[PDB]
Amino acid sequence: SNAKDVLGLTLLEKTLKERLNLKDAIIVSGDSDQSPWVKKEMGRAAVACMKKRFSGKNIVAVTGGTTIEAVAEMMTPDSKNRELLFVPARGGLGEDVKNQANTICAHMAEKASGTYRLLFVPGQLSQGAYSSIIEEPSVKEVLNTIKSASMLVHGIGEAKTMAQRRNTPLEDLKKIDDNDAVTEAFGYYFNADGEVVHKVHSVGMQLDDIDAIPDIIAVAGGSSKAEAIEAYFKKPRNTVLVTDEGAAKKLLR
Amino acid sequence: GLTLLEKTLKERLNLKDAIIVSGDSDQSPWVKKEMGRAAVACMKKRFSGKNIVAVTGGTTIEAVAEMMTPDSKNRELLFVPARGGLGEDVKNQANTICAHMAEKASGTYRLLFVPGQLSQGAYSSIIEEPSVKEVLNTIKSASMLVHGIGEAKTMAQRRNTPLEDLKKIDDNDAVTEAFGYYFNADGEVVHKVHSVGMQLDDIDAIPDIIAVAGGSSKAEAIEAYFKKPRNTVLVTDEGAAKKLLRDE
């Protein structure tokens, strides 16, 4: 791309990909912490990536958060009219409704003119209530769909920001802090070496399941996320990263 | 004339107030948007410093959502659905309208996540669950209710009403519908859709109730619903009002 070349983004992407051992790196101009449109440009770039990687039939698992909402906002119908079913990767994770995976999932499916299936297994269910619900055909159906996800599109957050934004129980806050979590993705908090140190209990996709998903696209940016992004990628994730100059430049400094 | 028409409607229907926009929404589709615009203006006049706004679904309340804009006075706004989905398609569900309105208002919202067609056991589990209980509690403290009114048969058929309930609605001569209750010509409940959240008895405790409903086809439905005192502001159109009042 001449635009990427002239802006120095081609080199920056090469450097970031090598640094983080990524399947690929896509970087948009600017710092989303400073300029609101940059998050939309990350959404647009993520959508372009999804479309490049779709096959004939697709089960797309998604997380919540404002960045994947931006992906949904930028989504458009598939000009190839390939089959698209969208599911949340996991539960609500204690997010407010606007940021819940179910919310982003429905928004994305509508924008893509695809279909969706939502997961309603609240985290605060009693043991007895959980046993009743987990056996429901509708719940089993969605869990089964998630298990065959062909794509995962997920955000990455700072551990503290995510813990504060969700309604995290005191005991779990202590655990996140005591174990020096620095990054978060799909309801897992990780330390600076990319090791899991706290897991939000939630049905659906577990960390071990991502290895079986051929196309994983993480979308996360802003200078404030530089250390979070670095930590998450300390382990092999077989993942494409869509980010911005804010995060990428700070990370590479 | 419109001021006289409003005065007569308020009296005939025992309204808190009548707001009548021009035209007939059954003939001129865009009149629904003008009802929406007037309803939003009415809501903003009624807001207190803090607000919990319960809403129903349906295309008329979707028009309210569509015409919603942020509050110039920046009052606190939390939007909730009044009841469950009531068997509506997604575009007509209270949850959908609720989210749309809150986004347009730059407010916050909470939704009732109570799926069908769950077994009895799972259903009761879902409704006892802490997050759902929180939302139900919020609805119980609603300061405003914004709702539609529909013709009984029309609403029952649009929703996926079971044949046995269709028969009961017919046998009991239901003529009007609002927030999941079907009423006869005397404004008496004859059938209720089972659903968590707001009940009919709860509306008396809500200080500001705004009904938005119009079109000549709804004249009989609107008259029937208001046969009992509802302490409600009606936003409607000339189509409904002139027909109801025999002033065509």
Curated annotation (Swiss-Prot), chain B:
Means of activity regulation: Stability and function are regulated by the effector molecule fructose-1,6-bisphosphate (FBP). In the presence of glucose, binding of FBP to the low-affinity sugar-binding site of CggR disrupts dimer/dimer bridging interactions and triggers a tetramer to dimer transition, which leaves two physically independent dimers on the target DNA and allows transcription of the downstream coding sequences by the RNA polymerase. In addition, FBP and several other phosphorylated compounds can bind to a high-affinity binding-site and protect CggR against aggregation and proteolysis.
Keyword vocabulary terms for this entry: DNA-binding, Repressor, Transcription, Transcription regulation
One of the protein's GO biological processes: regulation of DNA-templated transcription initiation
Keyword Coiled coil part of the UniProt annotation: no
Sample GO molecular function, one term: carbohydrate binding
Keyword Transcription annotated: yes
Binding site for beta-D-fructose 1,6-bisphosphate: 57-60, 83, 93, 158-159, 177, 218
UniProt superkingdom: Bacteria
Role noted for this protein: In the absence of glucose, represses the transcription of the gapA operon, which encodes five key glycolytic enzymes. Binds specifically to the cggR-gapA promoter region and blocks the progression of the RNA polymerase, leading to the arrest of the transcription.
Domain commentary: Contains an N-terminal DNA-binding domain and a large C-terminal effector-binding domain. Contains two distinct sugar-binding sites with different affinities.
Family assignment from sequence similarity: Belongs to the SorC transcriptional regulatory family.
Subunit field text: Homotetramer. Binds primarily as a dimer to each half-site of the full-length operator, with much higher affinity for the right site. Then, both dimers interact, bridging the two-half sites of the operator region.
Name by which UniProt lists this protein: Central glycolytic genes regulator
Organism expressing this protein natively: Bacillus subtilis (strain 168)
Section of the entire sequence shown: 93 to 340 of 340
